[PDB]
Ligand SMILES: CC(C)CCC[C@@H](C)[C@H]1CC[C@H]2[C@@H]3CC=C4C[C@@H](OC(=O)CCC(=O)O)CC[C@]4(C)[C@H]3CC[C@]12C
């Protein structure tokens with residue numbers, strides 16, 4: 367009884383710390399590699415930096431707080447931090463998918479109008495783009511949460527809101543559908559639509575330079591496909607819940623949300639497809 371709990375707590379604390387380490391180390395590396403390698407200070411990599419920041423915030427704040435909930439079996443940190451934690455969670459996934467959209471648009475523009483791209487895309491504008499994404503994402507995530515537009519009137523929902531060790535994020539049906547559409551589905555569609563036009567246009571194309579570019583494009587494609595595989599199961603289940611809470615087992619709904627957090631560890635590994643990133647990682651780790 368108390369032994370079975372001790373074994374589980376200690377083994378889970380350790381797995382959690384591993385995830386935290388991998389997310390934080392991997393994304394600090396990406397940021398430091400870009401922040402100290404001129405060859406890597408392209409405009410596209412400014413968006414990559416932004417994406418690393420969303421992942422870094424998941425590593426430093428989102429996962430650590432989720433970890434304490436899974437390991438200790440209650441929320442230890444009070445009402446405010448529960449709301450803040452929830453806000454940052456929604457914020458990071460919103461920021462990530464909107465950033466992946468920008469990246470897909472960046473590539474579409476550079477490939478179909480390399481001359482308009484040259485005169486339009488500057489560092490100052492890349493900066494404005496990045497901040498606009500974070501602004502919108504802040505908008506979509508903080509306010510509805512701080513204005514309590516997510517709450518429900520249910521017996522189960524009020525059972526959680528007064529209990530100070532509950533932080534389940536039980537929402538009303540309107541918020542579930544609205545946030546899912548606004549924070550995830552709409553940008554997911556834009557990104558797919560644009561990513562395929564990039565596919566077509568890259569395929570409707572010296573040989574060595576073209577092979578090198580198509581390698582980098584494929585890396586971005588993999589970044590986008592893995593993000594989709596990590597979050598689509600959760601958002602598919604979030605919706606299906608609205609209509610029938612019996613269709614999908616709870617343990618699996620929880621699992622899919624963690625698969626979402628997990629995505630934050632995957633991009634630095636995926637960037638090892640690049641010799642330039644690989645060499646900068648080797649140079650930084652000393
Ligand atoms: C606790 C939560 C709310 C986290 C808040 C994070 C944001 C404030 C971060 C995430 C991504 C960051 C951005 C990532 C990339 C850039 C590009 C960067 O462009 C540069 O001039 C530096 C690169 C160079 O040109 O050498 C300027 C900072 C900026 C806008 C950062 C500003 C701060 C941002 C928006």
Ligand SMILES: CC(C)CCC[C@@H](C)[C@H]1CC[C@H]2[C@@H]3CC=C4C[C@@H](OC(=O)CCC(=O)O)CC[C@]4(C)[C@H]3CC[C@]12C
Pocket residue numbers: 463464465467468491494495498499502506547548549552553556
């Ligand atoms: C709230 C959800 C449902 C909307 C998700 C849409 C976003 C993922 C993307 C789609 C196209 C993106 C926009 C495409 C182009 C621009 C112009 C861009 O660059 C500038 O405006 C700089 C120009 C300057 O100030 O000189 C600012 C960001 C913005 C609005 C982007 C912000 C994010 C947008 C709206």
Ligand SMILES: COc1ccc(C[C@@H](C)NC[C@H](O)c2ccc(O)c3[nH]c(=O)ccc23)cc1
Pocket residue numbers: 432451452453455456459534535537541542543545546549550604619620621623624626
């Ligand atoms: C299923 O078990 C868990 C595990 C962790 C958590 C923390 C909460 C804050 N997770 C939020 C989730 O990542 C999310 C992110 C972004 C969204 O737009 C979300 N919309 C929802 O309706 C419901 C959830 C939702 C909540 C429930």
Ligand SMILES: CCCCCCCCCC(=O)N(CCO)C[C@@H](O)[C@@H](O)[C@@H](O)[C@@H](O)CO
Pocket residue numbers: 493494495497498500501504
């Ligand atoms: C949850 C995170 C939320 C991030 C919120 C982003 C805030 C909106 C963006 C913003 O504040 N700026 C646009 C940045 O693109 C201000 C900058 O323009 C500022 O640096 C200017 O004062 C100077 O450019 C002029 O000297």
Ligand SMILES: CCCCCCCCCC(=O)N(CCO)C[C@@H](O)[C@@H](O)[C@@H](O)[C@@H](O)CO
Pocket residue numbers: 506510514515516517518519520538539540541544545548
């Ligand atoms: C970007 C996301 C923006 C979503 C904002 C949606 C807020 C809608 C308000 C809302 O739906 N409720 C009030 C919360 O302020 C809760 C009700 O759905 C529910 O509690 C009861 O009315 C039940 O009886 C079901 O009808």
Ligand SMILES: CCCCCCCCCC(=O)N(CCO)C[C@@H](O)[C@@H](O)[C@@H](O)[C@@H](O)CO
Pocket residue numbers: 381382385436620621622624625628
């Ligand atoms: C309230 C009870 C909910 C408990 C849910 C906790 C699940 C543990 C989360 C976790 O750290 N992983 C499983 C994810 O759920 C491991 C991840 O690193 C995983 O994604 C990778 O191992 C694979 O992607 C590649 O091998």
Ligand code: NA
Pocket residue numbers: 526527528529530531532533
């Ligand atoms: Na509570």
